[PDB]
Design an enzyme around this catalytic site. Structure first.
Site, PDB file in Angstrom:
ATOM      1  N   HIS A  39      40.627  39.464  43.732  1.00 29.41           N
ATOM      2  CA  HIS A  39      41.670  38.744  43.074  1.00 29.41           C
ATOM      3  C   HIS A  39      42.706  38.179  44.053  1.00 29.41           C
ATOM      4  CE1 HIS A  39      44.834  37.761  40.248  1.00 29.41           C
ATOM      5  NE2 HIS A  39      45.628  38.644  40.821  1.00 29.41           N
ATOM      6  N   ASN A  74      43.026  33.387  37.104  1.00 26.04           N
ATOM      7  CA  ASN A  74      43.468  32.456  38.134  1.00 26.04           C
ATOM      8  C   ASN A  74      42.847  32.827  39.474  1.00 26.04           C
ATOM      9  OD1 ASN A  74      45.077  30.947  40.043  1.00 26.04           O
ATOM     10  ND2 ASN A  74      46.591  30.715  38.415  1.00 26.04           N
ATOM     11  N   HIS A  79      45.479  43.532  32.924  1.00 25.05           N
ATOM     12  CA  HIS A  79      45.609  42.494  31.901  1.00 25.05           C
ATOM     13  C   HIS A  79      44.679  42.653  30.696  1.00 25.05           C
ATOM     14  CE1 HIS A  79      48.495  40.462  34.376  1.00 25.05           C
ATOM     15  NE2 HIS A  79      47.632  40.336  35.364  1.00 25.05           N
ATOM     16  N   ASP A  94      53.802  40.202  39.075  1.00 28.96           N
ATOM     17  CA  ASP A  94      53.521  41.149  38.018  1.00 28.96           C
ATOM     18  C   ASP A  94      53.318  42.595  38.495  1.00 28.96           C
ATOM     19  OD1 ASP A  94      50.917  40.489  38.966  1.00 28.96           O
ATOM     20  OD2 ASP A  94      50.094  40.587  36.953  1.00 28.96           O
ATOM     21  N   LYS A 141      38.545  42.864  36.005  1.00 26.67           N
ATOM     22  CA  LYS A 141      38.482  41.616  35.248  1.00 26.67           C
ATOM     23  C   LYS A 141      37.151  41.564  34.452  1.00 26.67           C
ATOM     24  CE  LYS A 141      42.369  39.679  35.852  1.00 26.67           C
ATOM     25  NZ  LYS A 141      43.035  39.196  37.101  1.00 26.67           N
ATOM     26  N   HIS A 174      51.547  39.712  43.968  1.00 30.88           N
ATOM     27  CA  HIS A 174      52.026  38.889  42.866  1.00 30.88           C
ATOM     28  C   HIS A 174      53.150  39.591  42.099  1.00 30.88           C
ATOM     29  CE1 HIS A 174      47.959  36.523  42.506  1.00 30.88           C
ATOM     30  NE2 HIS A 174      48.776  35.958  43.379  1.00 30.88           N
ATOM     31  N   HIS A 202      49.448  44.744  44.469  1.00 35.66           N
ATOM     32  CA  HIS A 202      49.263  43.497  45.192  1.00 35.66           C
ATOM     33  C   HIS A 202      50.536  42.673  45.141  1.00 35.66           C
ATOM     34  CE1 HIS A 202      48.939  41.712  41.360  1.00 35.66           C
ATOM     35  NE2 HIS A 202      48.287  40.628  41.718  1.00 35.66           N
ATOM     36  N   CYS A 251      44.961  44.118  39.039  1.00 36.72           N
ATOM     37  CA  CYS A 251      44.505  42.763  38.709  1.00 36.72           C
ATOM     38  C   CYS A 251      43.121  42.435  39.266  1.00 36.72           C
ATOM     39  CB  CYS A 251      45.537  41.729  39.108  1.00 36.72           C
ATOM     40  SG  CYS A 251      47.172  42.147  38.494  1.00 36.72           S
TER      41      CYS A 251
END
Ligand code: QST
Ligand code: ZN
Ligand code: ZN
Length: 219
Positions: free
Chosen positions: A137, A165, A195, A79, A159, A77, A75, A156
């Protein structure tokens, strides 16, 4: 100081890389990605947070005689995409979805050199599959499936203990997306989140539960 880049074997031909960054309001955030080996070629599944750790990761595999054939970013982002610019400077092919590249462009960030569009895409035919479950996400999040090992990189999107976030999230669509993902990969041997720790297919169930809750909470 932040912890160093880690590289750990997960299965035959499959390594987990973990990098670390200080993120405002979260403190030190770990980020897991994979390196997948196919014969003597390596594929990065997500870059580390930074160019520095992306270089360290590449160097490690090259010094062990693996040619880096490409990266794919799950994705937009940073990270998952922070290393794209450095990979592009080294002429290593980078891949992202058409939507991921559109969101990078919109945010003024470097794009992947290769894009794909559609629900399913083979990065490496019969070895590394990409699947879009729908928004969660982020609008663009995809997962990566390794059919020979039955390992799903959920990124991400996965979860198990809380959604994190929600700034770019689509909380209305996440349960539907998570249910599709569960249905497709319910038979996964391992599920790798960005994560939190590696688990089994229950992480798909726990993600669905957490999405259904967040949507309820938001009313
Ligand atoms: C700059 C680093 O990238 C982020 O800011 C992330 C990207 S997933 N966003 C956060 C969130 O979703 O809470 C997080 C703590 C999971 S890391
Ligand atoms: Zn993210
Ligand atoms: Zn993340």
């Amino acid at each position: 100081s932040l912890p160093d880049l880690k590289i750990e074997k997960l299965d035959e031909g499959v390594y987990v890389h973990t990098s670390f960054e200080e993120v405002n309001g979260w403190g030190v955030v770990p980020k897991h990605g994979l390196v997948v080996l196919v014969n003597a070629e390596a594929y990065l599944i997500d870059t580390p947070f930074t160019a520095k750790d992306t270089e360290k990761l590449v160097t490690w595999f090259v010094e062990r005689g693996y040619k880096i054939k490409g990266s794919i970013s799950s994705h937009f982002h940073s990270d998952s995409t922070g290393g794209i610019e450095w990979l592009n400077s080294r002429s290593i092919p980078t891949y992202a979805s058409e939507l991921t590249n559109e969101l990078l462009k919109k945010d003024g960030k470097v794009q992947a050199t290769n894009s794909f569009s559609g629900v399913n895409y083979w990065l490496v035919k019969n070895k590394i599959e990409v699947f879009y479950p729908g928004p969660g996400h982020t609008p663009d999040n995809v997962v990566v499936w390794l059919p020979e090992r039955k390992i799903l990189f959920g990124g991400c999107f996965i979860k198990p203990y809380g959604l994190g976030n929600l700034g770019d999230a689509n909380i209305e669509a996440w349960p539907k997306s998570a249910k599709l993902l569960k249905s497709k990969y319910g038979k996964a041997k391992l599920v790798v989140p960005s994560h939190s720790e590696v688990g089994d297919a229950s992480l798909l169930k726990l993600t669905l539960e957490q999405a259904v809750k967040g949507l309820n909470e938001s009313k």
